[PDB]
Amino acid sequence: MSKIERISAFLNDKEVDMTFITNPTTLNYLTGLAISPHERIAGLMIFRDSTPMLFTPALEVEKAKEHTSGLDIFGYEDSQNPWEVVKNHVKSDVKSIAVEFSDIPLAKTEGLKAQFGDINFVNLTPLIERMRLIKSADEIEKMKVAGDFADKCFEIGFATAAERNGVTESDIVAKIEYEMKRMGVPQMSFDTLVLSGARAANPHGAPENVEIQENKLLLFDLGVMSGGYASDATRTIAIGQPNDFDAEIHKIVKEAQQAAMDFIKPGVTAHEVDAVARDLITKAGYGEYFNHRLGHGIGMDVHEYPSIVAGNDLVIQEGMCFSNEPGIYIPGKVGVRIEDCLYVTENGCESFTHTDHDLLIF
Amino acid sequence: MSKIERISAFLNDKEVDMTFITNPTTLNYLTGLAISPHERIAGLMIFRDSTPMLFTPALEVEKAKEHTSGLDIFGYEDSQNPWEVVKNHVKSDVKSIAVEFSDIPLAKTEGLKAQFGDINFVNLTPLIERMRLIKSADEIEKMKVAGDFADKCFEIGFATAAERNGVTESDIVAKIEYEMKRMGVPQMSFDTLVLSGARAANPHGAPENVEIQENKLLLFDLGVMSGGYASDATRTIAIGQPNDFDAEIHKIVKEAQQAAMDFIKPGVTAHEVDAVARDLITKAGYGEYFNHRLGHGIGMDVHEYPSIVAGNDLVIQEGMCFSNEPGIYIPGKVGVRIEDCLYVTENGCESFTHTDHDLLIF
Ligand SMILES: [Mn+2]
Ligand SMILES: [Mn+2]
Ligand SMILES: [Mn+2]
Ligand SMILES: [Mn+2]
Numbered sequence: 001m002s003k004i005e006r007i008s009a010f011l012n013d014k015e016v017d018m019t020f021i022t023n024p025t026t027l028n029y030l031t032g033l034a035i036s037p038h039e040r041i042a043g044l045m046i047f048r049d050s051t052p053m054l055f056t057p058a059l060e061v062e063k064a065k066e067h068t069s070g071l072d073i074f075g076y077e078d079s080q081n082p083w084e085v086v087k088n089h090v091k092s093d094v095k096s097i098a099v100e101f102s103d104i105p106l107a108k109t110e111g112l113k114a115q116f117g118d119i120n121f122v123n124l125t126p127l128i129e130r131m132r133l134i135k136s137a138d139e140i141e142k143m144k145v146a147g148d149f150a151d152k153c154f155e156i157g158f159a160t161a162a163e164r165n166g167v168t169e170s171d172i173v174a175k176i177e178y179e180m181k182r183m184g185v186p187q188m189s190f191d192t193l194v195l196s197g198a199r200a201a202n203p204h205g206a207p208e209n210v211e212i213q214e215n216k217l218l219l220f221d222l223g224v225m226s227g228g229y230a231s232d233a234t235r236t237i238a239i240g241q242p243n244d245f246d247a248e249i250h251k252i253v254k255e256a257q258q259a260a261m262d263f264i265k266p267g268v269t270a271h272e273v274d275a276v277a278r279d280l281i282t283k284a285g286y287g288e289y290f291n292h293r294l295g296h297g298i299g300m301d302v303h304e305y306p307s308i309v310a311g312n313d314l315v316i317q318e319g320m321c322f323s324n325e326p327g328i329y330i331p332g333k334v335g336v337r338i339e340d341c342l343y344v345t346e347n348g349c350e351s352f353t354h355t356d357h358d359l360l361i362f
Numbered sequence: 363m364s365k366i367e368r369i370s371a372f373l374n375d376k377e378v379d380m381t382f383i384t385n386p387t388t389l390n391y392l393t394g395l396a397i398s399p400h401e402r403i404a405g406l407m408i409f410r411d412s413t414p415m416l417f418t419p420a421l422e423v424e425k426a427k428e429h430t431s432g433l434d435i436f437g438y439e440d441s442q443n444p445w446e447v448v449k450n451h452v453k454s455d456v457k458s459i460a461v462e463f464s465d466i467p468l469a470k471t472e473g474l475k476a477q478f479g480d481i482n483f484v485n486l487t488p489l490i491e492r493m494r495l496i497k498s499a500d501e502i503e504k505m506k507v508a509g510d511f512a513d514k515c516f517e518i519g520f521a522t523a524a525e526r527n528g529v530t531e532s533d534i535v536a537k538i539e540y541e542m543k544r545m546g547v548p549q550m551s552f553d554t555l556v557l558s559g560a561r562a563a564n565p566h567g568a569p570e571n572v573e574i575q576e577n578k579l580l581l582f583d584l585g586v587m588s589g590g591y592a593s594d595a596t597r598t599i600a601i602g603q604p605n606d607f608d609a610e611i612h613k614i615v616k617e618a619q620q621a622a623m624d625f626i627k628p629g630v631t632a633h634e635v636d637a638v639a640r641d642l643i644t645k646a647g648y649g650e651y652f653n654h655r656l657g658h659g660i661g662m663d664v665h666e667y668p669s670i671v672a673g674n675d676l677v678i679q680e681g682m683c684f685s686n687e688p689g690i691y692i693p694g695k696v697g698v699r700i701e702d703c704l705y706v707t708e709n710g711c712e713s714f715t716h717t718d719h720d721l722l723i724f
Contacts (some may be wrong), residue, residue, distance in 0.1 A: 039665075102467055105465060105466060105467055105468075106466050121468065125436065175540070177539075181535065181540075184532070220472075340632070
C-alpha cells in the first residue's frame, strides 16, 4: 500500500498532527513532480485522516495539477504572507508537525510557529531513508538508462586520450561532458575525475591542465542524472605499455571485484560481501592500502543506504542497489580502482554498466 | 568601519551578544576564506567588545590562517560533538545570537540550544544585503574579469551557428560551455539560453534539439562565475538576411537601451531609469509587449539589489551594480532583447561587456 498511506500510518501510530515536507528530491519521489522552488515556498502536507494538500507559488499551480493526482493544490502571490494562506486552509488544532531536520531553515519554522502556536517538531527523515532502500522494477529501469550513458562516457573518454598531441586531464573531462550535453543530459551526478599516473593515489586529487604521462595508467570515475536517477562507475586503462608492477596491481583489484560480484545474492550479509574483496587483497600483501568500505547505496542520490562495510550484519535482500568498488592506492607510485553499481535479484544480481574490465592499452 | 567593525556596532545597537554566521558565500565575503563544508560545521563569531573567533573542522584549521588575519581560529575532531567545543570555548554569557534566517537549518539551532539554553535568535541578513549593495574597487576588477569571459562566449556562439549544416540550439549551448570548461571556469551563473525565430517570444522558452531557422533572428543570453563574482548579458543577431519588420524591431530596442546608458549617473532615481527606455518603446507603438522591469542587481549572485522598476524611488549612488535590458516580444512573430550590466562612477556609468550591439548577419 502506497508511500502516502505509509506516512499517514506513521502519524497515527506516533500521534502527530501533520507533515510539512520541503526537500525537492523528496517532493519528486512522493508526487512524481520535479519542482524547483528556489527562493519561494513549497510544501506537502499529509494528515491522519484527510486529503493531502500541496502548497506552491501561484505560477506553478496549473502545471502541478496536470502532472499529479490525488492532491489538493492551492497557491499564493508575492502580495501575500504565505503562512497566512496556509493557516486559512487548515482549520484544526495543530500541536505537532513532522519536518526534515537537515533541510528546513529557521525562517520556515518560525513562520510556521507564528500561526499554529508553540509547535513540537518531529523528524521525518529516518522514515524516508528507510522507504528508499528497496526499489521497484519501475525505478530499476530508469537507473538502467543512466547506466547506458555512463558506458558511452568511457568510449568517448578513452578515444580522446589516445590522440595524445598534448591532451590534458581537463581537456578529457570537458570533451566527455560536451557529448552528454549534446544528447540532452541535464547534469553529471558528481564531479568527473580523470587522474594520470601517481596522481591517482591521492584521495583528494582533481583533474587539472597537466599532460597525461606516457607508459602510466589513467583513472576515470564518472556518472549522470537522467529522469531523476543516478549512476556511478570507475575504470582504469593504460596509455602505452605499462611496467610489470602496475599491471600486477590492476590484476589484483580486477579479480577481487569479480569475486564479490559472483558472491552477491539474497541471504548473505553486508559484512560478508565486504570481506570477500578485502581478504583477497590482504592475502596478496596490499591490505594497508585499501582504506575505505567496499560500497554504498545508490538511487535518486549518489549516496544512500545500505553500507557495505565491516560490522554491518544486515541481510542482503532482493531490490537493494549499491556499489562494488575495491582499490589499492600507493602514494608516489600507482593507484587503481574498478567500480560497478548493481541490483539484487531472486537468485543473484545484475550490474548497471557493461564496459570491459580488463587492462586495455591505448 | 571595516566590515567586522560594522557587524559589531550593529550588536551594540540591538543588544545582541554574538553572531553565528554559517553561509560560505557570506564567510568568503567577510574574511577571504572560501571553503565547501558539506555536512560538517563551520561558524564565525563576532562580539560586542571582544576578539572575533572562527570555528572550522579539524582539517581546515591551518588553511584558514593562510587566508585570514586577526581571528582566533580553532577546530574539532569527527569523534567530538561540535556544539560542545563551541560551548566550552566561549567563556562569556550568551542569551542571544544573530544568524542568517534563510540559511541555517533546524538541526543546527537545536544543537546550539542544547548547549547554551533558551536562546533568543536575531536575523543578520538585512545588514549583509545593505553592505553588499555598494561595491569596492577590488570587487569591480573581479566583475570585469567575469565580463570579458562573457564577450568570449559571444565570439564562439556566433561562429558555431554560422556553420549551419543542421546545427540546433542545444548543439550551440554545448559548444559554448565546452570552451569555458577548457579555460578552467567552475560553472555558469544561470542556464544558458539560445532561442530561434518565434521561439524567442516565449517568456518560458528553452534551448532544444531543433534546427535554427534561416532568415530569422537568434537570441543569446549567458554568463559565468569567476573568482566568486558573476556576469550577465544578451545579444540578438540574424541568420541570413532578415525581413524589414524584424530589423525595425531590433533598431527600436537598440536605441532604448543606449538611451538609458547615457542617462545613468548619481542622483537619478530607479523609477526614472526604467521610464527612459519604457517611454521610448511606448511612443513607438509597442509598449504592450515590453512586459518586465528594466533591470536587477548583480554581484556575487545575479539576483540582488537594487531593483530597476516603476514605483521604486531609491536614489542611485556611486558603486551600485545593476543590469539594463529592455526587450520586445510579439507572440508568433519575433523576440528581441539587448542587455549589459554596469557600475556607477562618480559622474556616470561604465559597462562590464563590450561586444557590438548592431544587427550582425552571419
Ligand atoms: Mn565513483
Ligand atoms: Mn561510488
Ligand atoms: Mn539579467
Ligand atoms: Mn540575462
